[PDB]
């Protein structure tokens, strides 16, 4: 309402510019509700769709990223590498602005491992802590797919 704060402490134009302490509302023309903007502070930055999806994409064009690549990074289908930190994948070093899948990112970032179920009652051939080559037999029916340290999960019998 014109020159009237929310709670009504200051109700006329003698106060113009006052900000009511109780209710917090400015005394001015109500017309400003057509003019004054608010804003939302995002937790994560978000891309403006015009500069993504308007072809040829402006963001894609500056960064030399195709339509498909830019979609995949923006919509969380693929990682893009900012700093390889000496990473290497499949024998070749990971270079910046390279796209990694989830499996590729997890293997790089958290390492590669595998867990092998043991047929009920069957006891292991190798012992806990023992280094194992790929292809080596863990149990009568269990063969390891990768090199590394074998670890016992839940011993049923001590």
């Amino acid at each position: 309402k014109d020159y009237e704060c929310a709670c009504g402490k200051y109700k006329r134009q003698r106060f113009e510019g006052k900000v009511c302490e109780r209710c917090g509302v400015e005394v001015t023309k109500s017309i400003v509700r057509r003019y004054r903007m608010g804003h939302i502070e995002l937790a994560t930055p978000a891309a403006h769709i015009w500069f993504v999806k308007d072809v040829p994409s402006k963001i894609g064009t500056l960064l030399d990223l195709s339509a498909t690549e830019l979609e995949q990074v923006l919509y969380f289908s693929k990682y893009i590498v900012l700093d390889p930190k000496g990473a290497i994948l499949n024998g070749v070093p990971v270079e910046k602005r390279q796209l990694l899948t989830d499996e590729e990112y997890r293997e790089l970032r958290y390492g590669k491992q595998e867990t092998y179920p043991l047929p009920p009652g069957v006891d292991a051939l190798v012992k806990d802590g023992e280094e194992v080559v790929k292809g080596q037999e863990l149990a009568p029916g269990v063969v390891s797919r990768l090199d590394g340290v074998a670890l016992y999960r839940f011993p049923r019998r001590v």
Partner: protein, 263 residues
């Protein structure tokens, strides 16, 4: 150890222990570094070859990896893996956009302008036109990514009581609400340390909420009010088309002092 004092296994006398019939065997590609005294790195820490692990500096790591401190096996595992920086979403892109030296890219692209192949010169031009746009204008490319999202003044998206005391409201209010809800939930999930799968889902949903707000239907299925097939009317829809702001309220208007009748 067990739930109740009984059923516990307490050692009857002096002896040595052997483990049998494990449920599964976990093969990890990792290095094991046993330690007699105290360990200086705690579990989860990231480590490069040469970093000190336990026993005041005696034992150190041979590989790049992630620290697993085993208090049972009394060994410090290092799981082979790197401190690699790889990101998803608009945050990654905002970073790559900040890290653009447009001056350099103009130079690089001009050198590309001397190449004989027609396609080489053509693409370098289109890129160079975008580069030059930003250069001449003074706009920073990272502005194509939003951090603060503007909110249109309320009287332009009104909530008004119609004649019958009923309420009528603009579709933008619902589009903002989806945004606000998803942003707030994202803040909460961050403070509560949700797993990356959950935080990632929230982030991609946040992008879609911004997308529907700015241009609904542009990417992916259009956002609708419940139990209606009508796409909500977004900012882009308001501006453009026959019914848009330009061709409806700007290049033509309804006017006062006017009338009509049969001739």
């Amino acid at each position: 150890a067990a739930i109740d004092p009984e059923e516990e296994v307490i050692a009857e006398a002096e002896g040595v222990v052997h483990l049998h019939e494990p449920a599964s065997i976990l093969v990890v590609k990792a290095r094991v570094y046993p330690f007699e005294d105290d360990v200086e790195v705690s579990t989860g820490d990231r480590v490069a070859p040469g970093d000190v692990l336990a026993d005041g500096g005696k034992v150190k790591s041979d590989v790049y990896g992630r620290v697993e401190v085993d208090l049972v096996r009394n060994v410090v595992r290092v799981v082979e893996s790197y401190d690699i920086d790889a990101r998803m979403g608009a945050e990654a892109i905002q970073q790559l956009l900040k890290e653009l030296d447009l001056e350099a890219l103009e130079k690089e692209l001009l050198e590309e302008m001397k190449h004989p192949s027609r396609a080489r010169r053509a693409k370098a031009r289109k890129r160079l036109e975008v580069v030059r746009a930003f250069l001449d204008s003074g706009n920073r490319p990272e502005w194509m990514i939003l951090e603060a999202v503007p909110v249109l003044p309320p009287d332009l998206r009104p909530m008004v009581q119609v004649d019958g005391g009923r309420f009528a409201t603009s579709d933008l209010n619902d589009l903002y609400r989806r945004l606000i809800n998803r942003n707030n939930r994202l803040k909460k999930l961050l403070a509560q340390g949700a797993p990356e799968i959950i935080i990632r889902n929230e982030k991609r949903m946040l992008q879609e909420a911004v997308d529907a707000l700015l241009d609904n239907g542009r990417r992916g299925a259009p956002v609708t009010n419940p139990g209606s097939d009508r796409p909500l009317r977004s900012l882009t829809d308001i501006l453009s088309g026959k019914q848009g702001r330009f061709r409806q309220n700007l290049l033509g208007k309804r006017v006062d002092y006017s009338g009509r009748s049969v001739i």
